[PDB]
Each structure stands twice: as structure tokens, then as C-alpha cells.
Amino acid sequence: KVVAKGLGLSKAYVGQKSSFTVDCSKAGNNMLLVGVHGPRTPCEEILVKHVGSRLYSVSYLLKDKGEYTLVVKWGHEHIPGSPYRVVVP
Amino acid sequence: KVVAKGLGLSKAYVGQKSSFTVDCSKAGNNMLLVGVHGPRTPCEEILVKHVGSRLYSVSYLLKDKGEYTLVVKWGHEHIPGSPYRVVVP
């Protein structure tokens, strides 16, 4: 009952914040875990903000071209669509 | 082989950013995940930054008093000390 949306689920660009949301309004009081895995150059930054009504706005910053793995877990289980493949040109 | 350090592992105050570091320099190329579980009001913000050489800075922001659980995982296993109990006055 958790739903992710946004451009950052699939794309990011060097040096620019990529954004997506995770809507947990229809879920309970569990723990959200978000990470972006760069197997060579790590993700530079990731920010997860609760903006109200159990909507979370996520922004992350990548430094290098290539494929990254975006993981979004709710109670330690992948939300639908996770793990996501993120491509940086 | 991951080591976390800092006051933010055990102390946080409403409205004030709480910080710690996570040293993954002696670990491999696995994935790092950080969560702050409030049984009630969610964590407002969590910011994770790779500061270089596989050291990471973490800052988080809470909006209500109470007991929180801070989770730091490396390849989906808890790092030593995780889960951390954080009591906000």
C-alpha cells in the first residue's frame, strides 16, 4: 500500500538533484529506508523529507555516469518497483 | 567492519539537527541504509552524504519528543550498535 512516483525512480543527471516521492498514506507506522547504490562512485547525497500526510520527498545527487540501484524499503521489504535501475548519462 | 561514531547515535532534540558519521572505509562496495523509526510522528528529515573515502555524514531532524529507533544497515545487516535507541526529551 506504499506507492513511489517521480523522475528519479529511473533517471538522474551528473551534479543535479534527482527527485522522487514515496506515498505512505495508506500504510501504517512502519520504517522507510531509502538508498542509492553506486558500486564504484557512491551516491554523493540523499535527502528524505517527510512533507506531511506520510508523503516523503526524496532527492539525491550523483557524480558519475553509469547504472545505480535505488532501493526503497518499507518495513525492510521492497515497495512495488524496488529495486529500481537508475541510469545516469 | 563498519564503524559509526557521534552524539547523534544516542541523543537528539526536537527541531535541532542531530549528526553522526559512518566509516565504511574498511568494508567493501555494499549498500548503506539509514532509517529513523518513530512509532508515532515520522522523522522529519534524514540526510546522508558520502564525504569521501567511504566515510559518510548523517544528519536527521525530529519534531516530537519520545523514543526513536535509529537503524544503520550495511548490505541489509545491522552495523555494530544498530539498532540504536534515541530518547528525545
Side-chain angles (χ1 to χ4, degrees), chain B residues 18-87:
Chain B
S18 186
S19 303
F20 63 92
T21 60
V22 184
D23 178 357
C24 301
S25 64
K26 307 293 177 305
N29 298 307
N30 218 320
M31 190 182 61
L32 177 71
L33 292 298
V34 183
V36 175
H37 190 190
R40 196 173 278 160
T41 309
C43 173
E44 279 229 315
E45 300 186 13
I46 179 139
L47 170 61
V48 181
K49 299 167 101 150
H50 177 227
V51 303
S53 307
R54 309 306 186 84
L55 225 103
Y56 297 82
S57 178
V58 182
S59 289
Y60 63 94
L61 180 61
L62 305 176
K63 86 171 288 192
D64 199 12
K65 66 190 194 73
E67 177 168 325
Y68 290 76
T69 307
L70 167 65
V71 173
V72 187
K73 294 192 151 179
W74 177 252
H76 316 284
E77 296 286 346
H78 284 108
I79 71 163
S82 179
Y84 297 91
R85 296 191 43 262
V86 176
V87 179

Side-chain angles (χ1 to χ4, degrees), chain A residues 7-83:
Chain A
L7 305 170
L9 296 178
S10 66
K11 299 172 189 199
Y13 310 122
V14 173
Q16 300 203 354
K17 291 286 151 56
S18 191
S19 301
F20 67 92
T21 48
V22 187
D23 183 351
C24 299
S25 58
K26 300 310 168 298
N29 295 319
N30 217 319
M31 192 187 47
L32 184 66
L33 286 294
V34 180
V36 179
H37 182 248
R40 289 171 177 161
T41 306
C43 169
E44 282 221 299
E45 303 188 7
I46 184 157
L47 172 61
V48 178
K49 288 176 62 164
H50 177 222
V51 297
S53 299
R54 308 310 178 84
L55 183 60
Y56 298 85
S57 175
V58 186
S59 296
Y60 63 85
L61 183 59
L62 306 182
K63 189 164 81 181
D64 250 351
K65 67 181 178 173
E67 194 193 318
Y68 293 76
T69 302
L70 166 65
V71 170
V72 187
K73 294 190 147 172
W74 175 250
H76 302 281
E77 300 275 35
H78 284 105
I79 70 165
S82 182

